[PDB]
Amino acid sequence: RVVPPSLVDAYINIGARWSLDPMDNVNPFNHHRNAGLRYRSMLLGNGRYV
Amino acid sequence: ASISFTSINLYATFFPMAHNTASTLEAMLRNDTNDQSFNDYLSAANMLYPIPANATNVPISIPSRNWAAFRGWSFTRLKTKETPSLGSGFDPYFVYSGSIPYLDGTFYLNHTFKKVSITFDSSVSWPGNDRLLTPNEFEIKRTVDGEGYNVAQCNMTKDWFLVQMLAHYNIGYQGFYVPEGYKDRMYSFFRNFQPMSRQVVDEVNYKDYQAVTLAYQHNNSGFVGYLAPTMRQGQPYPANYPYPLIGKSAVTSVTQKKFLCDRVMWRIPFSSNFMSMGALTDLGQNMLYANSAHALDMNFEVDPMDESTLLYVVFEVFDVVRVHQPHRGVIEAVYLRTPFSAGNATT
Amino acid sequence: NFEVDPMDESTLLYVVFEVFDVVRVHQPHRGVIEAVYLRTPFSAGNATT
Amino acid sequence: ASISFTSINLYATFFPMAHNTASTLEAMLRNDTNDQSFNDYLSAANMLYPIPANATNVPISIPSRNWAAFRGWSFTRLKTKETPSLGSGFDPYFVYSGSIPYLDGTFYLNHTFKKVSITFDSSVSWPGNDRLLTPNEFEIKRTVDGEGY
Amino acid sequence: PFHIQVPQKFFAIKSLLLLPGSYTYEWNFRKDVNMILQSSLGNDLRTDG
Amino acid sequence: NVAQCNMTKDWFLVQMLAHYNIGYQGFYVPEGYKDRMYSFFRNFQPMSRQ
Amino acid sequence: PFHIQVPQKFFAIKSLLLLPGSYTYEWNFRKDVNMILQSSLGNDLRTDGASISFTSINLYATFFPMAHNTASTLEAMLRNDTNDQSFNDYLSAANMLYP
Amino acid sequence: MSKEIPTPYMWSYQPQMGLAAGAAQDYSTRMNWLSAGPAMISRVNDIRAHRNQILLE
Amino acid sequence: QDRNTELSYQLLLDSLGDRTRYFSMWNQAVDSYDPDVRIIENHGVEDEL
Amino acid sequence: DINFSSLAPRH
Amino acid sequence: DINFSSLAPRHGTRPFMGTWSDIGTS
Amino acid sequence: DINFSSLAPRHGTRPFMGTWSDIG
Amino acid sequence: DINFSSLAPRHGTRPFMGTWS
Amino acid sequence: APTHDVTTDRSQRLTLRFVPVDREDNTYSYKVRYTLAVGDNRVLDMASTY
Amino acid sequence: MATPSMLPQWAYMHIAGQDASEYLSPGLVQFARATDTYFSLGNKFRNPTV
Amino acid sequence: MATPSMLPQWAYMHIAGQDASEYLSPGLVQFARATDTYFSLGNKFRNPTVAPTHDVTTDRSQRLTLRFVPVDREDNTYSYKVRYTLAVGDNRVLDMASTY
Amino acid sequence: MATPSMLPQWAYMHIAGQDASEYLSPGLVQFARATDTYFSLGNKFRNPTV
Amino acid sequence: ESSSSQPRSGGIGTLQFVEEFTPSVYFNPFSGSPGHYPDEFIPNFDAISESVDGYD
């Protein structure tokens, strides 16, 4: 499933601090720059067999 | 993904206390006046009430109860798909593996709440001594605000802001100066509260407005893929997507204001003045100056959501245990939960 | 449960739930007016979805 | 059509009376046993429930609630387009301009009701102490007399 | 359009405790846009709109 | 061993009682006062790969 | 097309007298054909092509009609602590199955 | 005759015709459940004795 | 069932030291999000050359 | 959040 | 005994003047 | 030293049975 | 009613009297 | 027999059925939730439910 | 949760206590003789045997 | 007596009553203090913490904030003046740190 | 407050209890019935009908 | 001079509900004849008709 990059480009609410409306109801801890969950993942290493 | 366990050991780390000062200690703690006492950090009676898809209100009813030693409500909103059933080992319908806000405290839907009503006996408002600008009910935020009851650059009510500041730090009557970092933790209200606003073009004042949908929007043409992360396509041409707000053909626009709190549970103390005054509140001891059992009915109002959601209300109580050992290899306890039932209870 | 007739157009059902809605209005001093608003089985904090 | 206001002005009329008569009255009605009290002519909780187009039933469920000091119910049918919302002062979907039967008692769809069933705890038919000749429900109307009902 | 809360900064009544009675409080405000706004280039905002 | 490194749990106990005096009431993160630049905890980084 | 009446067998709700009030009640029902259908040869009915679907499930109940004076006297004496109901499991068991 | 020393009856509240809306047993209290030791029979029902005595007075 | 202790242990450890100091033994390493992802502070790009 | 005061005797 | 069944705080009674069931508590 | 000073040689005297030290 | 003429009460406001100070 | 002093006289159904308030259908199970309500001054036995 | 354990919790759960008609109020006993000829209230209360 | 009736239960279970250092035997109290530097026993016990029930706050017939409309307005060209006639009720006190 | 959680103020709002000639001061009642031909004030006071 | 209203009879106040309705301990539950049983612990009972009617 691929998103249009024109939906969130780099012109979105330019000049303001706003969280997108379809991102307010999205879980933000289900993100890959969650650095707590990055830590736990790589504390077990990069294999799928641990 | 599959996981299995081979070998689980238990490790005990013993202080090598001296023999004859350890026997002094033992003798002391076989007394029933020296019996150890503990309490749960968040003393809670935990209730989950479904919110149907796009429901705007969820009433709560509770039968008559002696509310001796009760402490404030706290509440947050979860998602049905993200919360597993509790009380039953294995939930087969739980097909989610992301963060579980129920158990991790990773709340993020606290900004959809819009009112809370507290009623005892179904006829008397708890905010009924006219403690609030809107006399019955706390309002969490204002939609349709023309009477200026909002704190700085967000929808949050002045009344709500006051309650929260009092709840988590006891400040409101000496101003609203920032808390110290000692008393402003990772899950404290103040830290996680972020106002925000933008201005965006309307149609009820702007007369050259065209609603162009995403497909027919173009901006940065000839340099980006068309509605896909593919290779560039098209020609350099004037853009036509966003509308200026700079100074040259800056269009009329309408402010959108909102806030976000994440990792915060909303909290209303059960206290006559919402500032904290030690663990046992003055209204927990006023159910001993008001011996009786009252019904507790509440009402909440939330934003619609397409996804099914849950309402998680922590009724704060005292979960407290007293652990005695009378004799060697004997341990026992008496457990007490105060306004919610002390035992038998829920399985 | 109310059994209505079919209508071609969208319609609303208007149900009135009759209550007492009484206001005590009294002034105990110059330039001081206060009021208590009570509504009996449906109060000002109790409502249906 | 467009309306302007220039001058929104407030008027008051006072009963002239002696300033001993006036001041006696003030002291009498500054006691809280002489508190004035007022109530609505139609004192009611007012709730609107949709009827989908071509629906034949509307279910209502109300939560467990104390019904001390409860009087009757009344009911009538309105239409979606002929009813504005008063809860939002903004209301751009209202395209009607005729007689609004919500804010004026100009009801006209009270012949489009066939039955109403009232029950408590989903197991007690309220006027079902055999009071009605058809006990478990009221019927507003029926086709076929069925022995002169 | 803006909504803002502005504190009292005067060092005699910003931490004062004020007892019962009726008082007349007035404070005046400044509508000059070179004193209530800040700029990032320090350009005059009264040679601009 | 101590989770996700070669370090032994016997050793870990000794170094936690020598740099912070903790281990008989359980292992916990030191205070900022307790462990500094040249103290154990801040400099101890486990790791693994597959 | 079947129509069946199916009892509860759990021992804490077997013969309880449930007094006035509203109670949620929820129970799960299997749809595995092997589990709920016996055979005389003990085939694999999943393999064979047996299939089942539940359409409509309701919960019947029957109240004794009782004088309201005498059934509120009874209520009074069953809402009391020392008038607790108590049941046994007919076979009280700890089930341990060993290979 | 005597069946325990029982939990008190908590009266409810109502908008007053002059009734107290009945009463019901207190179930926001222990002292009649299980799990502790048999040496707490006069340490937990002495509590329940004390609560009742304060009530009569 | 109406006790919750998994949640309550995360609140315990926010009241005792920092949650941002990671400990690999008992696996403390609090979940976080970057506040530049959730809240988007688009302030353009510094193309000027 | 913040629950309960100092639950340790002052030594 | 071997499998539980011990229950019953009941006897049953019928007042005289015939057998007339229910005494309705004494 | 550009600075303030306040009533501070007296302290919260409260017991672990009441968050308020009484007043006659 | 079939009346087109008010009554007078035939008595002034307040029966009840206070002392001179 | 008793003189109607053991039986209702204010009209109540003997036989009732509670329709589901929720139904969940699945690939191997079915879950049916009901509200089982007992009116005031009525005695319900769970032996007679099915 | 409360005191009953060992011999005490065999008198609370009716494993080894007194009669089944001595746990109960004397009035509930008398109403379970009067009406237990058409509506058995008994057989819902444990009787111990030792 | 005339005391709260939940007081014996609370006292026992340390929701109210006396600090565990008046509740504990005196020998245990001095043991804990002696070995406080390497073997804490403080977190094994509870201290009751209890609000004042009287003379503190009465919320009866009082809002916790008021709004005051202007009673003067000057809408000059560079300045604006507004007056407010404050009313501080009897048996109330105002802190000016929370005026904004 | 936790003590007010009922309304004996269902007679404070006059929908039960006393009629207006019994809950009013006797001086107001005299004033009211001596001025009613030219200034009515009988509509300002609820009378309960029960 | 001026005075204040006539005595009122009705339900008890909420401040005086607490003092009139201290919790009751029944020490010999449901012992003796019916007619000495508390029927005023039933929230459906009326003692000025001695019947329990809830219209359910």
Numbering used by the authors:
A (entry chain C): 497 to 546
B (entry chain C): 596 to 942
C (entry chain E): 894 to 942
D (entry chain E): 596 to 744
E (entry chain A): 547 to 595
F (entry chain B): 745 to 794
G (entry chain G): 547 to 645
H (entry chain S): 1 to 57
Task: Please quote the authors directly.
The ChAdOx1 viral vector, adapted from chimpanzee adenovirus Y25 (ChAd-Y25), is the basis for the ChAdOx1 nCoV-19 vaccine (AZD1222/Vaxzevria). We have determined the structure of the ChAdOx1 viral vector and used it in state-of-the-art computational simulations to demonstrate an electrostatic interaction mechanism with PF4, which was confirmed experimentally by surface plasmon resonance. We have characterized its primary cell attachment protein, the fiber knob, and show that ChAdOx1, a simian adenovirus, shares considerable structural homology with human adenoviruses.
We have resolved the capsid structure of the ChAdOx1 viral vaccine vector to a resolution of 3.07 Å, the highest reported resolution of an adenovirus capsid to date. The pentameric penton protein, located at the 12 fivefold icosahedral vertices, had weaker signal, which could indicate a less well-ordered, or less stably interacting, protein than those observed in previous cryo-EM structures of HAdV-D26 and HAdV-C5. As in other reported structures, the penton RGD loop (residues 305 to 335), which is responsible for binding to integrins following attachment to the cell surface via the fiber knob protein, was left unmodeled because of the lack of signal, indicative of its flexibility. We observed partial densities for 12 copies of pVI in the base of the hexons that adopted two conformations, either wrapping around the hexon interior before extending into the capsid core or extending directly out of the base of the hexon to wrap over the top of pVIII. Hexon was well resolved, including the hypervariable regions (HVRs) on the exterior, enabling a complete reconstruction. ChAdOx1 is more electronegative than HAdV-D26 with negative charge extending into the interhexon spaces, while in HAdV-D26, it has electropositive charge in these regions. Results show freely diffusing PF4 frequently contacts the capsid surface of ChAdOx1 between the hexons, most commonly at the interfaces of three hexons where negative charge is concentrated, and the interhexon space is maximized. To identify amino acids that are potentially important for the ChAdOx1/PF4 interaction, we calculated the frequency of contacts between PF4 and the ChAdOx1 hexons in BD simulations.
